[PDB]
Each structure stands twice: as structure tokens, then as C-alpha cells.
Amino acid sequence: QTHGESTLSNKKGAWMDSTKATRYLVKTESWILRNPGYALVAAVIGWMLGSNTMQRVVFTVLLLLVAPAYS
């Protein structure tokens, strides 16, 4: 588990601020690029699970986010 943002009200940089944006997104983008066929599965399941457009898109996003980071 990564440390995450501290609560010390720091104005300088932390240990790794260069990767602060890509710290969590590296695994998901790499997993999606390696296995792009899942994007169809997540979209279809989200479309068939939600009765509203908001529910369908939220389902699609959650499925696209949970598969790379398995839990």
C-alpha cells in the first residue's frame, strides 16, 4: 500500500510528486492497453445493468476501473 498524501499542510514537495498524477493510473492504462477486449464486456454489462443513461455510464466506469485494479 502506498503512503498517499500527507496531512501535515506541506507547501514543498513530497517524496514523489513527479508521479503524483500517474501513481494510480499506470496500472489501469497498461491493463486496458494489454487487454482491450474487456472494454466491450464492461460497456455491454453496464448497458444491460442500468435502466438509465447515468446508471449505465456509472456501471461502465466502475467495471472499467475494477477489472485492472482487481480489488
Binding site: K12, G13, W15, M16, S18, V26, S30, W31, R34, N35, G37, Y38, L40, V41, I45, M48, L49, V66, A67, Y70, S71
Partner: protein, 501 residues
């Protein structure tokens, strides 16, 4: 080389007149072929070995940073360019620092700095590719003949008796013919080229431990990497940390050794032995065809043993439904056929259980000869009778289980083999067959689609998605979409459970 003591063991029955049978020799998993009027053979691949590996990429996990240097610029003079941009092996990062009259500047604002550091990582995790023309599967074939407990697993004695042989199967020579003494000849025509997809895996050496890793996973590592036989490193900034910006000097420190992080990242990798640029794999599968036309039963013309036998020790169940016992022959007449059978009742004396050691016989003519005999008793109480009359000896045996339970176990093993081998599983124990070919084609199509859809999931993701798909199929109104949802969910759930985690 032998099939005794193996946790994984498969039995195949050859039909009358079956000249050959297609096998899939799995790593550390023997298969025993039983046929009528022919000696039973057990053939297994011991290891897959490939030499002259070609290096492709070499990540490095322990880096060294030295020769720190930075160039500072005033807030108006634009960005700062250090003179080490033209020098390779130097990693430079542009930063922003506060500049003012206290720092020696002329104006007040955000200055520009360019800190460079010499990158030279010493310990690297080199990955190598496997050349399809250098692999050589080692396959061992054994015949159940006159053997002792002490000499059943001794390869030297079995080769001396011409009952076993270790031979190397290569793409250049996929076919090997093993010449047995009086059991005939057994020919194996394998497919070494397609047995293991070398293009799908890399041989990665991290520290003193070597692994077989996915090609896609290896290329996705975020570490400084250099191509084969080159010192040009790329992505060097991943192992380098730039500290708080400073006009006079910004400190750059390399991160700690990533060897442990690599080991944690190699959780699913298959450890292999790597020595002298040669990799040895005890896992994998090798599709092969065993031809037994020249395989002839030995000892058919021998006489029966007139003298009495004795049980040296208790028979032991092998866990596969077969029972192995050792017999000592009191007589010294010579090579004679052992009259051993498995019977339900001592009065009935009818053959009810088959013998794995087909046509057992004493080979040596000494006074006392120890013979190892393997039988497959029926479920329930049964007797193992040797001889008839006053010389008859009996050994009661109880075989726990049922045929229905055996059927369920066989179905589970078939499902596990199908999951592990995919389309190759249909080739296992298949003698031609129109059903086999169409099943293999349909499974190829379905496996391609299934891999393209859910290839990269772990067991947790597969299990959760299978449960969700099952729930959707239960509530689905249309029968067809409900059926496909249930099928996909069941397959995903089985795959998640099949990992035993």
C-alpha cells in the same frame, strides 16, 4: 521415468486393433496406456530444455547516481540548459525554484534550473527469448515388466533390461523410435514446435532466480531498460528521485534496489533453471502420438509357475485406483508366468479386476525372485489370488469409493485438463474421431473469443464477474441471452475456483 509415485496419473484404454493414440504429455504428469494383448506403457515428458537463448531486453533494478550538477537561470532569462544534455548516461530534469536578491539574482520570480546526474545501474534483470529451433523435450517411455520394488525406479537397471529409455525430442527430429528388448518397438511422433509457445514467454533472470514470464508483462515493466548488447538506458528517471529544487544545487538520489519489488511482481511467474545460457523447464505440455504396432507382449509363450508364491509386504494403494504388491517366488524352475488375479470371492475365483502389469512373469531363475505387480481391483471387497490349489495364496483388499464417484472425479479431471490445455486437451487420449475434431474446432473458436474477452483477469475478478453474469442470466427474460450469460458466468466461476484460491 516410471509412473509409480506420481500424484498426477492418467489411464487410457486402447480399443481392439488400436495402432496409435494421441497423447498430451504434461510436465510432471505420467500417462499409462493399457491395451489388450500388448504390454502397458507409461510415457511422460520429464523436462523441456532450450539452449542458446537470445537476449532481448534487460531492465535494471539497482541504480547509481553520481556527478550531480545543476544550472540556474534568472526568472527573465528563460529556461536553463545544462551542458550535460549532449552527454548520454546523464539524466536531466528541468525544475522551477524561487529566485530573488537573496539568492544572487537580479529580479524576483520563479527561476529555472536543470539538474543533471550520471545514471549507471549495475545489477540488471536481463530477459531472453526462446528460439523455436533450440528446444528439446526429454521424454521417457517405460514398460511394465519384471521389476522389483528396489529396482522399479532405477533408470540404470531398466535400461539394462531394455525396459525404459530417456530420449530427446527436437523440432529437427520430432519422431523417436525406442527399441525394447523383447517387448518390440514403440514410436512417438510428437509436435515439439507447437508444444510450448516460445513466442508467448520470456526467460527473465532476476538475481539468482530465473523465471518464465509473459512477453506482454515483461515489456510493460516501468524500469530503466537497455536493448541487447547496448549500454543505452531509457526511462532512467523511474529509478531516480529529484529532491526539492535549489538554485545552488539540487540533490538527486537513486531509489533503493527493486529486486524485491520485482520478486513481488513475479508472483505468477514459473521458476526455471538457467545455466550456461540454457533454460530447463519441468512444466509445460507436449502433444505426441504413441505408435504400438511393433509393441509385442513378452512372456506369452512361457509356462505357468508350478511352485508357490508369497507376499513379501502389504500391497499399497497408489491413489489412482491401482494396487501395487511385491511377490517372492519360492521355486527356481525358471522364467514362468505368474498366475495372479483379482477376484470378488475366493469360491468364485473369476477375474473381476484387471492387471496394470499385463502378463506378469518371473524373469530370473534364482531360488527366490521378487516381482512387482500392479493390479486395478474393483471397488469394494476383493481378493488378490496367486496360484491355485494347495499353493494358492490370498490377500484381501478393500477399495474405497464408487464408480459414480470415479465418474465425477474423471469429469473434474477432464474439466481441469480442458482449462489448463485449452484446445490441446481434446487431443489427449483420442484415436481419430469425428467428434474430437469438431469439438476441438468449436473449442478453438470459443477459447479465442473467451481469451479476447476475459484474458487478463485474476481469480477475484473472474469470480466476481461470473457471479454477476449468473445473476444477470437468472433474471434475463430471453432464454438465449440467459443461456449464454449463465454459460459464461459458470465458466468464469469455475476458472476462478479452479486456481484453488
Amino acid at each position: 521415468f516410471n509412473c509409480l509415485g506420481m500424484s498426477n496419473r492418467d489411464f487410457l484404454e486402447g480399443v481392439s486393433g488400436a495402432t496409435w493414440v494421441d497423447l498430451v504429455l504434461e510436465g510432471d504428469s505420467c500417462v499409462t496406456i493399457m491395451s489388450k494383448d500388448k504390454p502397458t506403457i507409461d510415457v511422460r515428458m520429464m523436462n523441456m530444455e532450450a539452449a542458446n537463448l537470445a537476449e532481448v531486453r534487460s531492465y535494471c533494478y539497482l541504480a547509481t547516481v553520481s556527478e550531480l550538477s545543476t544550472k540556474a537561470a534568472c526568472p527573465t532569462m528563460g529556461e536553463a540548459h545544462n551542458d550535460k544534455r549532449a552527454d548520454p548516461s546523464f539524466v536531466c530534469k528541468q525544475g522551477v525554484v524561487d529566485r530573488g536578491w537573496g539568492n544572487g539574482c537580479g529580479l524576483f520570480g520563479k527561476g529555472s534550473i536543470d539538474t543533471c546526474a550520471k545514471f549507471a545501474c549495475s545489477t540488471k534483470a536481463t530477459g531472453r527469448t526462446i528460439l523455436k529451433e533450440n528446444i528439446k523435450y526429454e521424454v521417457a517411455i517405460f514398460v511394465h515388466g519384471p521389476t522389483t520394488v528396489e529396482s522399479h525406479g532405477n533408470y540404470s537397471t531398466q535400461t539394462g533390461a531394455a525396459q525404459a529409455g530417456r530420449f530427446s525430442i527436437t523440432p529437427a527430429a520430432p519422431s523417436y523410435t525406442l527399441k525394447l528388448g523383447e517387448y518390440g518397438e514403440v514410436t512417438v511422433d510428437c509436435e515439439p514446435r507447437s508444444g510450448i509457445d516460445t513466442s508467448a514467454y520470456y526467460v527473465m533472470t532476476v538475481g539468482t532466480k530465473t523465471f518464465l514470464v509473459h512477453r506482454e508483462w515483461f515489456m510493460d515493466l516501468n524500469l530503466p531498460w537497455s536493448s541487447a548488447e547496448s549500454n543505452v538506458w531509457r526511462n532512467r528517471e523511474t529509478l531516480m528521485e529529484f529532491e526539492e529544487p535549489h538554485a545552488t544545487k539540487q540533490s538527486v538520489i537513486a531509489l533503493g534496489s527493486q529486486e524485491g519489488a520485482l520478486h513481488q511482481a513475479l508472483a505468477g511467474a514459473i521458476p526455471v533453471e538457467f545455466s550456461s545460457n540454457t533454460v530447463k523447464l519441468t512444466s509445460g505440455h507436449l502433444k505426441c502420438r504413441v505408435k504400438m504396432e511393433k509393441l509385442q507382449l513378452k512372456g506369452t509363450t512361457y509356462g505357468v509357475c508350478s511352485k508357490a508364491f508369497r507376499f513379501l509386504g502389504t500391497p499399497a494403494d497408489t491413489g489412482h485406483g491401482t494396487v501395487v504388491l511385491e511377490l517372492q517366488y519360492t521355486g527356481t524352475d525358471g522364467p514362468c508366468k505368474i498366475p495372479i488375479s483379482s477376484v470378488a470371492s475366493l469360491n468364485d475365483l473369476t477375474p473381476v479386476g484387471r492387471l496394470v502389469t499385463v502378463n506378469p512373469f518371473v524373469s530370473v531363475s534364482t531360488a527366490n525372485a521378487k516381482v512387482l505387480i500392479e493390479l486395478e481391483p474393483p471397488f469394494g471387497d476383493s481378493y488378490i489370488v496367486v496360484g491355485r490349489g494347495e499353493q494358492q495364496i490370498n490377500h484381501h483388499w478393500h477399495k474405497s469409493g464408487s464408480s459414480i464417484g470415479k465418474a465425477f472425479t474423471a469429469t473434474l479431471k477432464g474439466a481441469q485438463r480442458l482449462a489448463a490445455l485449452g484446445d490441446t486437451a481434446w487431443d489427449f487420449g483420442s484415436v481419430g474421431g469425428v467428434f474430437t475434431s469438431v469439438g476441438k474446432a468449436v473449442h478453438q473458436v470459443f477459447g479465442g473469443a473467451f481469451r479476447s474477452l476475459f484474458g487478463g483477469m485474476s481469480w477475484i475478478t473472474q469470480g466476481l464477474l461470473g457471479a454477476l453474469l449468473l445473476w444477470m442470466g437468472i433474471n434475463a427474460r430471453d432464454r438465449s441471452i440467459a443461456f449464454t450469460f449463465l454459460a459464461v458466468g459458470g465458466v468464469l466461476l469455475f476458472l476462478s475456483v479452479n486456481v484453488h484460491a
